[PDB]
Amino acid sequence: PVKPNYALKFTLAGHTKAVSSVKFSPNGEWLASSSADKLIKIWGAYDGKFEKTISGHKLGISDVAWSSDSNLLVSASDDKTLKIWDVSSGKCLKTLKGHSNYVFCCNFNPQSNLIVSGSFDESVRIWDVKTGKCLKTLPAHSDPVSAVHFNRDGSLIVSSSYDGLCRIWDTASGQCLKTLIDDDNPPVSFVKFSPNGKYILAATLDNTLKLWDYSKGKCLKTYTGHKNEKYCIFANFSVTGGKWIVSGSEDNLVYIWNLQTKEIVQKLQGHTDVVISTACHPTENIIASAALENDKTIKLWKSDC
C-alpha cells in the first residue's frame, strides 16, 4: 500500500484534564486511557463506547499498560506509586511503593509476571506482579526517565531519559548492556523496541524520531517533519497493514511515516491540542490518539491498509 487512509470514527470525551496515555488491550477489545485528572477510563475499541472509570491514585497519571491477559492494568502516577488494577472489577489489587518522585512510565513483560517503571527519581524499577514487591532498582539515568519497554521475550529493557541517553538492560541481572549516545545530546523523550526486538525507536526533543540497531550502535532511519520539542509523546510501529511509524505532534496532528522510505504518508487532523499519545490496534488498522488540556479527548481512526 502506497499510503494509509485513516479516517475519524469516534471522539471519546470524559476526562476532565489533559489525557496522558492510551493503550489497546492485547486482545483488541478495549482501549484504556490515563489522565492528569487522576483517572483511568476504559472504552470499547470498536464502538468507542465508554465502559468504566477506575479511580484511586492521589495525583495525575502519566501512563497505563495492559497484562497479556487483557484484564490486569498497571498505572504510573505523580503520587510516586504504581497501582495494579483488575479491570473487570475496577479494583486496585496492589500499590507498588518505592519510587521517591513521579512515576512517569510503565509496562508489563510479555510473561506478565513483571512490571518495569521509570521515574523522575532517575531510576528504573522492576516489580513482581504477584507480590507487589520491588525486585530491582536500577540506577539507570541522571535525569527523569521518560520511557521503559520490554523486548519481545522480556529478556531486555530499554530506557530513555532527559539525560540524553538510551540504555539497554538485561532484565534478569539488571546489568546495562548498551548505552546509545548522540554527540549533541538532545533529551530523549520516548523509546520502545520494534515488534521483532531487533531495533529501538527513540524520540528526541529536536523534532526527530530515530530507528536504531542498538547492538551495532547504528542509526538506520530518521523520521522528521513533525513538532516535538516539549513533551514526551508516544510513538509506535504500525504492522497490521502497511509498515508505518506513528506519532503524535505538538502541532495537534497525528503523523504517519513510511517505515522504510521515511516519507510522511498521512497527517490526521482533528485534535485541538498537542497529541501526546497514539496507539496502534493489535490486529486491525485502527489508531487511537489523545490530546492535552485544550482538547481532553481520545480519537479513534480506521484505515483500509
Binding site: 496522558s20 492528569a36 502519566s62 523522575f120 533529551p187 526533543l205 516539549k230 501526546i276
Partner: peptide, 9 residues
C-alpha cells in the same frame, strides 16, 4: 507530569 513540559531544550 506527562501533560506538562518538564524538559530542558
Amino acid at each position: 507530569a506527562r501533560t506538562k513540559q518538564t524538559a530542558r531544550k
